[PDB]
Design a protein around this ligand. Structure first.
Ligand code: Y01
Ligand code: Y01
Ligand code: Y01
Ligand code: Y01
Ligand code: Y01
Lengths: 261, 317, 147
């Protein structure tokens, strides 16, 4: 009831005492909690379901629509369509499901509460930024009264600032590890790199941070080692192929954070 | 040792510099082609040019097919379609043409082929700014020029109204006996346009006076044009081109801060193209299309050592 | 006058990539202007001189007013009236617009907004090199090098 009625500070108390989100969320707890009009709802969510009462497969068609490209949401895969259509009806990561729920239903304080305690939080900030931003773009076009694109933008810019602040946090503690956070496969969010997930939404303060502009400067070098290598020795070694063999390079301890082919 | 060739050639620096060295070879050959006398049969240099633009177009089709309206968003891809399409319109009229052979090599089809062949180098020199825009310092200026051309447009419109409102009564006073021709447009825009840029046409002012060129134009009324040119040069050169310096001057810092971030963002899409380009430049790409992700690899140990680094950074946040 | 001499080099080293863009605009007008106007050429090193030469002085005031509209009356160079030479007033119009209204006017904005930080840096670089200047004159003998 506290989730449907948007009581954030009762979700705080009520999981702080004794309720695990594991074994709370079953599949009919999402169908319910998604198709209830007993709280503040998102009126344009049904406009996105018009691409097709509400089933989770019709939800992940919305999520695959909002996060474009080859984004495969977990609900539309074969294993979920076999557990669906009738212990196994729980979710392995429940707060990844309620972060998407609280972003689609346009309830922000619930979303910034469900964000801040789960695993892989900087990826949830960017997923939430992309979902909000593309709902804003799919609300500027087709609405007349309280279009709320002015409201959904500044909800994507409140998560897209969290992502930046977390990456500025993790950059200052270790740099070779923070550059690993940018490109590791997420495996919950459709095997998307965190940095690609922040380029799909055009999140310029993330891609222009010194963590991503340092990783791009380490992908530009490739295997070579331009910290000590001559700049002109690249052009010389292009023109003179026996000058390739003796310039400089990098070892696998230095190529660890660089995503190789 | 043979992993040092595979390691060297697949770096994006080496794909980049290998591509721009062959691009500067393309421009040097293409302006030797263009500047020197064209003949009926193409020279050695010209087939290298057509080989570059043909196989370059093949690589652009491969880069579009591996979504079209995404590719038209960059301003150096709209210029690539116009460069490649108008090159072969120029090469169609150059090569597939009637000779009408003489000591005079000018036939009406060959000449237009050579002029669509001369005006086309401009697109490739503009394409050099896509290369000059990849380093830390010259990137924001190239990303800044377009962001300020798109921003001064309504000072340039006011300068064009001042340009017309001097161009029309200056001809109309000086040249009363005209017949309708399209040289009226050329001469009302033409002569007051170069007065912004230094040429005051000093002897053409005071057309009635001695020490003057154009002495045949001494009709009644021509004593007005030094006053019209005086007010025109005052307004244009002292108000308009001096409100444009103030405009760039006060817009510069916000457009540098914006354009620096737009460069830092588009550096991602620039580097991820060079993880996909084959290791040959487009004249040497006759091999790597007859022949034919970037994921990060962590062990099970370091995925856990990374996974409790992220939790520590969030809790410290 | 110390900081200005220490400042000129610190801003020549700093405007280099606006001058490179001005040199690309300079070439991309210099080559089709010759190529349109002079179709019958043989390979010589006077091609380089004449593609850089005439569009270089247009930044500095000389518009070459009579050489524009080579077909027209009241014109020097009246022998160059081949087909296609009606294009060069449009190329010179776009070249002078871009060069003189965008590039040399983005250079005034560049010096204008860089001036105060380069004056603050260059003043300190002068005050530091004044030490190495005075300690040379505690070592020079008392005679001008002819004496
Ligand atoms: C991106 C990082 C790894 C640094 C490498 C960037 C290069 C791709 C840029 C920086 C310098 C640029 C060069 C700077 C100067 C020139 C000269 C330019 O022609 C002129 O300046 C002629 C001047 C004249 O003749 O008046 C042709 C492009 C070129 C080679 C540019 C090609 C692209 C370059 C090499
Ligand atoms: C003989 C004459 C015609 C030669 C004149 C050359 C111009 C036609 C070239 C010189 C500089 C070029 C510009 C250089 C940089 C850009 C930036 C480019 O935009 C960007 O890359 C990002 C800016 C944005 O996102 O708006 C748009 C094209 C533009 C204006 C180019 C348009 C064509 C320009 C004006
Ligand atoms: C829209 C604002 C900026 C003012 C209108 C623009 C006018 C200042 C000028 C610009 C060019 C002028 C035109 C310049 C050239 C001609 C061609 C000429 O008409 C013809 O050649 C038709 C006779 C023929 O072709 O035999 C004389 C008038 C006309 C249309 C002028 C009419 C007024 C125009 C459109
Ligand atoms: C060729 C004929 C037409 C005369 C042209 C004069 C130039 C060749 C002279 C005039 C001013 C001179 C400059 C005057 C001052 C300096 C500052 C000097 O740097 C410093 O003294 C310290 C600056 C720093 O520390 O970076 C570097 C040389 C430079 C640019 C000089 C380079 C040569 C310049 C441009
Ligand atoms: C690097 C970017 C900026 C573009 C490349 C610069 C090209 C625009 C221009 C600059 C000078 C031009 C050269 C100017 C002079 C000549 C001399 C001339 O060649 C010769 O003299 C050989 C004939 C002989 O010597 O008998 C004609 C082509 C060439 C190389 C031109 C080829 C194209 C060049 C290199």
């Amino acid at each position: 009831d506290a989730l449907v009625m948007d009581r954030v500070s009762f979700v705080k108390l009520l999981i702080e005492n004794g309720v695990s989100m594991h074994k709370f969320l079953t599949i009919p707890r999402l169908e319910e909690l998604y198709n209830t009009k007993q709280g503040p709802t998102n009126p344009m969510l049904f406009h996105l379901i018009r691409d097709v009462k509400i089933t989770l497969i019709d939800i992940g068609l919305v999520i695959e629509y909002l996060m474009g490209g080859t984004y495969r949401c977990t609900y539309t895969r074969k294993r979920f369509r076999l557990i669906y259509n009738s212990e196994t009806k729980r979710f392995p990561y429940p707060l990844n499901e309620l972060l998407i729920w609280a972003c689609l239903m346009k309830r922000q304080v619930m979303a910034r509460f469900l964000w801040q305690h789960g695993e892989e939080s900087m990826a949830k900030a960017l997923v939430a930024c992309k979902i909000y931003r593309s709902m804003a773009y799919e609300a500027k076009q087709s609405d007349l009264v309280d279009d709320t694109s002015e409201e959904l933008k500044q909800y994507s810019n409140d998560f897209g600032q969290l992502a930046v602040e977390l990456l500025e946090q993790s950059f200052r503690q270790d740099e070779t590890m923070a550059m690993k956070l940018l490109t590791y496969e997420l495996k919950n969010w459709s095997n998307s790199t965190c940095l690609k997930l922040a380029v799909s939404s055009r999140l310029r303060p993330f891609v222009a941070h010194t963590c991503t502009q340092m990783l791009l400067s380490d992908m530009w070098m490739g295997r070579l080692n331009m910290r000590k290598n001559s700049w002109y020795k690249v052009i010389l070694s292009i023109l003179v192929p026996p000058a390739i063999l003796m310039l400089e390079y990098k070892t696998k301890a230095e190529m660890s954070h660089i995503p190789q082919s | 040792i043979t992993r040092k060739f595979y390691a060297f050639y697949h770096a994006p620096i080496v794909k980049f510099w290998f591509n721009t060295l062959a691009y500067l070879g393309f421009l040097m050959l293409y302006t030797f082609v263009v500047l020197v006398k064209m003949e009926q049969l193409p020279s050695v240099q010209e087939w290298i040019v057509i080989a570059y633009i043909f196989t370059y177009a093949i690589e652009k089709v491969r880069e579009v097919f591996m979504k079209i309206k995404v590719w038209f968003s960059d301003y150096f891809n709209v210029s690539d379609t116009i460069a490649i399409i108008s090159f072969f319109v120029g090469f169609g009229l150059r090569f597939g043409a009637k000779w009408n052979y003489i000591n005079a090599y000018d036939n009406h089809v060959f000449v237009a082929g050579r002029l669509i062949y001369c005006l086309n180098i401009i697109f490739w020199y503009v394409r050099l700014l896509d290369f000059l825009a990849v380093n830390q310092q010259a990137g924001p200026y190239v990303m800044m020029i377009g962001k300020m051309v798109a921003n001064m447009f309504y000072i340039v419109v006011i300068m064009a109204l001042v340009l017309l409102s001097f161009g029309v009564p200056r001809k109309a006073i000086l040249y009363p006996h005209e017949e309708p021709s399209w040289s009226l447009a050329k001469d009302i825009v033409f002569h007051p346009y170069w007065m912004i840029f230094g040429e005051v046409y000093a002897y053409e002012i005071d057309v009635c006076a001695n020490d003057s060129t154009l002495p045949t134009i001494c009709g009644p009324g021509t004593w007005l044009t030094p006053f019209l040119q005086a007010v025109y040069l005052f307004v244009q050169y002292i108000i308009m081109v001096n409100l444009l310096i103030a405009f760039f001057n006060n817009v510069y810092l916000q457009v540098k801060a914006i354009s620096n971030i737009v460069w830092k963002y588009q550096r991602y899409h620039f580097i991820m193209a060079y993880h996909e380009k084959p290791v040959l430049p487009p004249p040497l790409i006759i091999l790597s299309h007859i022949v034919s992700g970037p994921k990060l690899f962590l062990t099970e140990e370091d995925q856990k050592k990374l996974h409790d680094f992220e939790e520590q950074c969030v809790e410290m946040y």
